[PDB]
Amino acid sequence: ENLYFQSMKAAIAQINTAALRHNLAVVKRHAPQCKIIAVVKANAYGHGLLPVARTLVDADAYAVARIEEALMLRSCAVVKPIVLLEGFFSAADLPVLAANNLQTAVHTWEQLEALEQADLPAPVVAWLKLDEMPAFIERLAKCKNVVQPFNIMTHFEQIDLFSQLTAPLLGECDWVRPGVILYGVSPFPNTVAADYDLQPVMTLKTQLIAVRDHKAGEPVGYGANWVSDRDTRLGVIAIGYGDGYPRMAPNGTPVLVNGRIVPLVGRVSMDMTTVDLGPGATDKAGDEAVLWGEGLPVERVADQIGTIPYELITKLTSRVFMEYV
Amino acid sequence: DYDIPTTENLYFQSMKAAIAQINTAALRHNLAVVKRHAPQCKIIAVVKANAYGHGLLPVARTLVDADAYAVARIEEALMLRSCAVVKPIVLLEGFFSAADLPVLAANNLQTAVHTWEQLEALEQADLPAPVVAWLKLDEMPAFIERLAKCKNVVQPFNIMEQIDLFSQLTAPLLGERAMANSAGICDWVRPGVILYGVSPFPNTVAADYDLQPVMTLKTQLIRDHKAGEPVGYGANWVSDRDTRLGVIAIGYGDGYPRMAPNGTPVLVNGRIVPLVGRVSMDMTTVDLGPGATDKAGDEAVLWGEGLPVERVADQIGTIPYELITKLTSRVFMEYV
């Protein structure tokens, strides 16, 4: 209400480029003689494909899930090699690879069959790994449309056969790449903290649209779900299920308002949701109110809801405004 | 007609991953059903959140017979006005900011007053030409007389356990109502979500009610033939019996919920097949069965024509309102 002009004050997901560059330096602090490879799939985990790619200029190579994202990177004058994770799931996706120089990843029999059947100038760089055990490694090696020797990208009791079979094969100290830790997400339930030199990039901010005072024993929340008669000054934030927030978990979801952690109450609507502050507290209309990120980690919020933090950052629809700092 | 593709979408007609087809023929059909029962009633759509994930601008051009429009925020109303829309735009939930009052008068919008903060800002602001305001939310305040005395409001207004008491108080007041709760268990009516082919309650689950869902969430079939043991990526694992499986290119990062691991219906080649295992970021597996062999790249519909969205929402647990609005920018909009 104390604003001056239109600057978009509703659902907003602020991205800190300073923390993004910091997380990449943390990987280089432990492994200096390693090939750093991002980790820019599903619109860079909901942080924006093109803006983070321009920021991570120190990254030796890029990695996407589909060709559509890889073509957007190459058009934005990137020269670093693009790795196609999960590979190609169409035979017509092979000539666009040899033309835009993309490094695919072969694992299924269908993409190996399509590689031998297709004829095209210049071969493509292939990566391999699984998800007893077929020895299609020699079939991939004898292929005419593949840069020989291929390349392997393993991981850090059920498999173990991949480790001994990769020993005679060459050969691209070390050259390891991250999971999601480049954004400040652990994400492991063993340690959901990730505060040890790790900063979250996405800070899901909103706005305090209205404040309601009960002043009487009324647990009613319009008529959908009830909570408690205890008199407390309630506040409503402008973020709903139609913005990307999950309708799951009632009393217990943490929300950071003016530094202090306040629990989310009742159900979630399409555009807004209510949160329990307190009668003694003084929260004015137009406050910060952050759902996940700085002050309250995304792994902590995901654990309270039940889902993994990977969904929380990718579930956000086109209604949320992308802020970059 | 379909607007020029905004920077940037794919040019593949055979599809790649995630597509939400919106049929305009059912959108026009549902509107005629409302007019069939109530002919002397002004129809008020019902385009609150990017037209419930169907696209604000394309459905507005289609619903030309609609007497008035209704949005949640000013941003959507300004997009309609710029697309040469002359019909009155109703601002649901009203304005939250005092600076949202001069734009309301300049673009001729119909705000909704319910909170005290809105009324305080209306009396405190001075602007040429008044705004048409709608009313509808000490206990039970009589601020109706205060709203009527306001200088920047088109007089009269225009109104839309707790209660019955509000329906009693609107009787002496003149003289334009609009509800909003139920059309069939008048002079002006506004539907809920029935204009898209979705029932607001799973009482009938759209079965024999007339009908036709607009959004048909299509995908593409991207093993073994065996059920196996590591089914998806991991964690949730089903049977091992020799049966034909299928994997569809739609994940949690597309808008699909990870909830209800097994039993969720998916329509593949007319036949209903249950969803198995968990849901990944870009894809999910579905159990086809031994009978009839299917090829990679089939239709595969999640909700809409052949399988209603209310039926899918009931199997997951959530309301159908979320399912159609949870879809992110990764899904491609087809009309065509």
Side-chain angles (χ1 to χ4, degrees):
Chain A
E1 34 72 72
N2 205 76
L3 55 116
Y4 311 127
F5 78 109
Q6 197 177 268
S7 296
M8 306 292 173
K9 40 260 148 287
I12 183 159
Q14 192 180 259
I15 317 295
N16 0 299
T17 53
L20 196 90
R21 288 190 203 95
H22 175 262
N23 295 335
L24 192 88
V26 172
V27 180
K28 210 181 180 176
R29 266 168 76 170
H30 278 94
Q33 296 93 243
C34 278
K35 188 168 96 284
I36 336 142
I37 313 126
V39 181
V40 278
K41 54 178 258 287
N43 195 253
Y45 285 85
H47 303 92
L49 184 96
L50 270 83
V52 304
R54 288 189 278 102
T55 315
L56 299 162
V57 71
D58 294 73
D60 302 85
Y62 289 95
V64 293
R66 56 189 66 182
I67 46 154
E68 274 77 69
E69 293 170 308
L71 296 157
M72 284 167 188
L73 296 167
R74 288 261 184 250
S75 63
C76 208
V78 306
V79 292
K80 299 109 227 166
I82 323 291
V83 183
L84 233 139
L85 303 156
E86 287 291 310
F88 58 95
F89 275 97
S90 179
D93 290 340
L94 273 151
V96 288
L97 250 54
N100 289 270
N101 294 128
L102 305 172
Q103 307 176 333
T104 190
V106 189
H107 48 82
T108 47
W109 283 93
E110 291 92 327
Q111 54 188 300
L112 187 121
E113 282 158 60
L115 253 149
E116 287 188 288
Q117 206 128 39
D119 59 305
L120 41 97
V124 287
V125 186
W127 300 84
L128 70 139
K129 220 207 128 263
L130 255 298
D131 300 72
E132 196 199 292
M133 302 293 179
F136 75 107
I137 303 108
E138 66 109 305
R139 298 190 184 197
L140 182 78
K142 280 205 143 189
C143 203
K144 203 169 238 290
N145 298 275
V146 69
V147 175
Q148 280 298 117
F150 23 78
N151 273 8
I152 9 277
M153 47 182 283
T154 47
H155 248 288
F156 46 87
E157 67 281 80
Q158 14 76 273
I159 316 147
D160 266 57
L161 267 139
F162 217 83
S163 181
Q164 52 186 63
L165 263 143
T166 42
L169 303 156
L170 288 149
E172 185 209 284
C173 302
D174 323 88
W175 52 87
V176 286
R177 83 130 214 214
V180 76
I181 40 156
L182 219 75
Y183 297 98
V185 190
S186 206
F188 255 90
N190 177 54
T191 173
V192 283
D195 297 297
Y196 47 103
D197 276 286
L198 262 300
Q199 289 173 72
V201 290
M202 194 196 281
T203 61
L204 195 79
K205 285 183 174 189
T206 186
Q207 286 288 282
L208 229 312
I209 43 153
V211 279
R212 281 175 177 175
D213 279 77
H214 286 333
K215 217 223 166 285
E218 293 164 290
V220 64
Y222 205 90
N225 192 73
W226 273 253
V227 54
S228 289
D229 92 285
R230 337 195 299 261
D231 296 356
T232 47
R233 182 192 60 89
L234 253 71
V236 182
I237 59 268
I239 50 110
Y241 52 69
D243 294 85
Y245 210 78
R247 212 167 178 253
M248 307 151 85
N251 202 310
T253 314
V255 177
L256 195 130
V257 173
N258 291 74
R260 188 190 60 176
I261 303 108
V262 285
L264 184 127
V265 283
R267 283 260 246 266
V268 178
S269 80
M270 199 175 280
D271 293 53
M272 62 219 165
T273 192
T274 182
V275 67
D276 179 59
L277 298 152
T282 52
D283 289 285
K284 298 140 199 177
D287 278 321
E288 331 89 280
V290 63
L291 285 312
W292 63 72
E294 191 223 277
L296 186 73
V298 67
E299 303 102 292
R300 209 158 282 175
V301 183
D303 191 90
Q304 254 86 92
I305 296 157
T307 54
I308 50 261
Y310 288 91
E311 187 177 24
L312 260 74
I313 52 169
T314 55
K315 207 156 84 69
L316 304 167
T317 189
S318 58
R319 210 190 204 172
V320 69
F321 180 76
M322 235 66 228
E323 186 106 290
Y324 294 93
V325 288
Chain B
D1 178 82
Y2 180 68
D3 60 279
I4 305 138
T6 50
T7 53
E8 232 292 277
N9 279 288
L10 38 281
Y11 248 99
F12 218 80
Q13 289 172 289
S14 190
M15 229 277 291
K16 170 81 181 180
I19 184 159
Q21 190 178 83
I22 324 292
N23 95 88
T24 52
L27 221 337
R28 289 191 203 95
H29 167 259
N30 292 135
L31 191 88
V33 172
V34 180
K35 210 180 183 179
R36 264 160 51 188
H37 279 94
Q40 62 266 115
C41 287
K42 68 164 203 288
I43 329 127
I44 320 145
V46 179
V47 282
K48 181 154 183 173
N50 195 254
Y52 284 84
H54 303 92
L56 183 96
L57 270 83
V59 304
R61 288 189 277 102
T62 315
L63 298 162
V64 71
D65 295 74
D67 302 85
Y69 289 95
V71 293
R73 56 190 67 183
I74 47 154
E75 274 77 69
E76 293 170 307
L78 296 157
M79 284 167 188
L80 296 167
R81 278 271 107 92
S82 63
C83 209
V85 170
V86 294
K87 298 109 227 167
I89 322 291
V90 183
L91 233 139
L92 303 156
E93 287 291 310
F95 58 95
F96 101 100
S97 178
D100 293 342
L101 273 151
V103 288
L104 227 137
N107 289 271
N108 294 128
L109 309 166
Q110 297 185 305
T111 182
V113 189
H114 48 82
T115 46
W116 283 93
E117 291 92 327
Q118 287 178 274
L119 196 125
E120 283 160 64
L122 253 148
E123 287 187 289
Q124 209 164 302
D126 60 305
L127 41 98
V131 289
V132 189
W134 295 79
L135 178 114
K136 214 226 333 193
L137 236 157
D138 203 286
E139 281 157 72
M140 285 67 183
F143 74 106
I144 302 108
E145 320 300 274
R146 247 76 270 169
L147 182 80
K149 254 77 171 282
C150 292
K151 202 162 105 67
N152 298 274
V153 69
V154 175
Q155 280 298 117
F157 56 91
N158 288 90
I159 48 271
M160 59 187 282
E161 283 284 273
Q162 215 165 10
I163 84 136
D164 311 287
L165 69 102
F166 188 89
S167 282
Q168 135 219 292
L169 264 141
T170 181
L173 302 156
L174 289 149
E176 289 158 291
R177 77 187 292 106
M179 197 131 201
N181 214 96
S182 190
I185 305 106
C186 195
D187 217 288
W188 329 264
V189 289
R190 54 157 279 103
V193 78
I194 42 155
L195 219 76
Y196 297 98
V198 190
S199 187
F201 201 86
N203 206 271
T204 51
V205 195
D208 307 80
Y209 220 89
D210 294 278
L211 247 154
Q212 217 79 275
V214 291
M215 193 196 282
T216 165
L217 195 79
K218 285 182 175 178
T219 186
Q220 199 107 279
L221 237 112
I222 53 148
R223 269 89 195 266
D224 211 280
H225 309 286
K226 208 176 184 178
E229 282 162 59
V231 283
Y233 229 89
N236 203 258
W237 301 318
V238 76
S239 189
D240 194 79
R241 59 155 188 170
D242 305 283
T243 46
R244 284 181 166 91
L245 273 169
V247 58
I248 45 160
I250 254 159
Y252 52 69
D254 275 291
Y256 210 79
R258 76 104 176 161
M259 293 111 254
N262 299 270
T264 313
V266 177
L267 196 129
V268 173
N269 291 74
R271 188 190 61 176
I272 303 108
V273 285
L275 184 126
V276 283
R278 272 181 201 270
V279 180
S280 80
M281 199 175 280
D282 293 54
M283 62 219 167
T284 188
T285 182
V286 64
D287 179 59
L288 285 155
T293 313
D294 294 17
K295 296 154 192 181
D298 275 319
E299 50 269 73
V301 178
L302 285 312
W303 63 73
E305 185 80 277
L307 184 68
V309 67
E310 300 103 290
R311 202 162 288 165
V312 182
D314 191 270
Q315 254 86 92
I316 296 156
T318 55
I319 49 167
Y321 288 91
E322 186 177 24
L323 260 74
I324 53 169
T325 55
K326 207 157 84 69
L327 304 166
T328 189
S329 59
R330 293 242 270 100
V331 69
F332 179 76
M333 314 298 176
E334 201 175 68
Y335 302 91
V336 182

